[PDB]
Design a protein around this ligand. Structure first.
Ligand SMILES: CCCCCC/C=C\CCCCCCCC(=O)O[C@H](COC(=O)CCCCCCCCCCCCCCC)COP(=O)([O-])OC[C@H](O)COP(=O)([O-])OC[C@@H](O)CO
Lengths: 233, 10, 11
C-alpha cells in the first residue's frame, strides 16, 4: 500500500489484539452463579477499558485536558465499541459466526434462537453493516481513520479546545481522502462509502444503549461498571 | 457456566 | 460526574 504519514501515526496507536484478548478471557474466568447476558456485559465493559486505554495514548487526544477527553468519550464510547465489533467481523468473521473480542467464534445460530425482538433488530442491523463494509474491502488504514473521525466529533459542546478537535477532523478526513485516491484510484466511490457508514454506526450505537438501558432497568446488568456509568449521561 | 465453558472448549 | 472515566484517564 501507500499510507499518508498521518495514518502511519494513527496505526502506531493500535494495541496488541492478542494481549487484550487473553486479558479479557482470564478476567472472565476469575469472575467465575453468572448468567449468559451478564457475562457479555462484563466482556463489553472490559473492552471499554481497552478503548479508553487506546484513546489515552493516542496522538492528539493525549494533548487534551481530562475534561475535554471525557466529553469526547462520553459522546462516542458506544460507537467505538460498535466500530470495534464491526471491524472484528470483517477480518476474522466467517459464514454465520460472530467473532468475539476474546477470540472465539459463537455460531449466529446460538444467538438467533435465544434473542428477543430488540436484540434481533440490533444484531441484524449490525450484520447488514458488516456486509456493506465486507464488500468495500474495508481495511485497517480506513478503520483507524473512522475511529478518529468518531472520537474527534464536532457535535460535542463545552470543549475548552474545540480548535484542536476541528483540526484533527480536518486532517484525518483529508488523510483518508488521500489514501482512497492512491490505493483505490479507479474506485472513486470508496471514500464516500466509508463516510456514509458513520451515520449508521451512530444509529446502531444509540439503539444499543437504549437496549442496554432497558436490560439495566429489568435488573439484568450486574452491579455497575464503566458501561453503566457511560450510560448514565 | 454455560457460555464461558463453550468458549474455552473450542 | 464520571469518577471511573476520570480515574482511567489520569492513572
Ligand atoms: C452488535 C450490536 C448489538 C449488541 C449491543 C450490546 C450492547 C451492550 C453490551 C451488552 C452485550 C450483550 C450481548 C448480547 C445479548 C445476549 O447476551 O443474548 C442473550 C441470549 O443468549 C445469547 O444470545 C448468547 C450469545 C451471545 C453473543 C454475543 C454477540 C454480541 C457481541 C458483543 C457486542 C459488542 C459490541 C457492543 C456494543 C455496545 C439475551 O438476549 P435478550 O433476551 O437480552 O434479547 C433482547 C430482547 O429483545 C429484549 O427484550 P424485548 O425487546 O424482547 O422485550 C420487549 C418486547 O415485549 C417487545 O419487543
Amino acid at each position: 500500500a501507500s499510507i499518508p504519514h498521518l495514518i502511519l501515526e494513527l496505526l502506531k496507536c493500535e494495541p496488541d489484539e492478542p494481549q487484550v484478548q487473553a486479558k479479557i478471557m482470564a478476567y472472565l474466568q476469575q469472575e467465575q452463579k453468572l448468567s449468559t447476558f451478564g457475562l457479555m456485559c462484563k466482556m463489553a465493559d472490559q473492552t471499554l477499558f481497552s478503548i479508553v486505554e487506546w484513546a489515552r495514548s493516542s496522538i492528539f487526544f493525549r494533548e487534551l485536558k481530562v475534561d475535554d477527553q471525557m466529553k469526547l468519550l462520553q459522546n462516542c464510547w458506544s460507537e467505538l465499541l460498535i466500530l470495534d465489533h464491526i471491524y472484528r467481523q470483517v477480518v476474522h468473521g466467517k459464514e454465520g459466526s460472530i467473532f468475539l473480542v476474546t477470540g472465539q467464534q459463537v455460531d449466529y445460530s446460538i444467538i438467533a434462537s435465544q434473542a428477543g425482538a430488540t436484540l434481533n433488530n440490533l444484531m441484524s442491523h449490525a450484520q447488514e453493516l458488516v456486509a456493506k463494509l465486507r464488500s468495500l474491502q474495508f481495511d485497517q488504514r480506513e478503520f483507524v481513520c473512522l475511529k478518529f473521525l468518531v472520537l474527534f466529533s464536532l457535535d460535542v459542546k463545552n470543549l475548552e479546545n474545540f480548535q484542536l478537535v476541528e483540526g484533527v477532523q480536518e486532517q484525518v478526513n483529508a488523510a483518508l481522502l488521500d489514501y482512497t485516491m492512491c490505493n483505490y484510484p479507479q474506485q472513486t466511490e470508496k471514500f464516500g462509502q466509508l463516510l456514509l457508514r458513520l451515520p449508521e454506526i451512530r444509529a446502531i450505537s444509540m439503539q444499543a444503549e437504549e437496549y442496554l438501558y432497558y436490560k439495566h432497568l429489568n435488573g439484568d446488568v450486574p452491579y455497575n461498571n464503566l458501561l453503566i456509568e457511560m450510560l448514565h449521561a | 457456566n454455560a457460555l464461558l465453558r463453550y468458549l474455552l472448549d473450542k
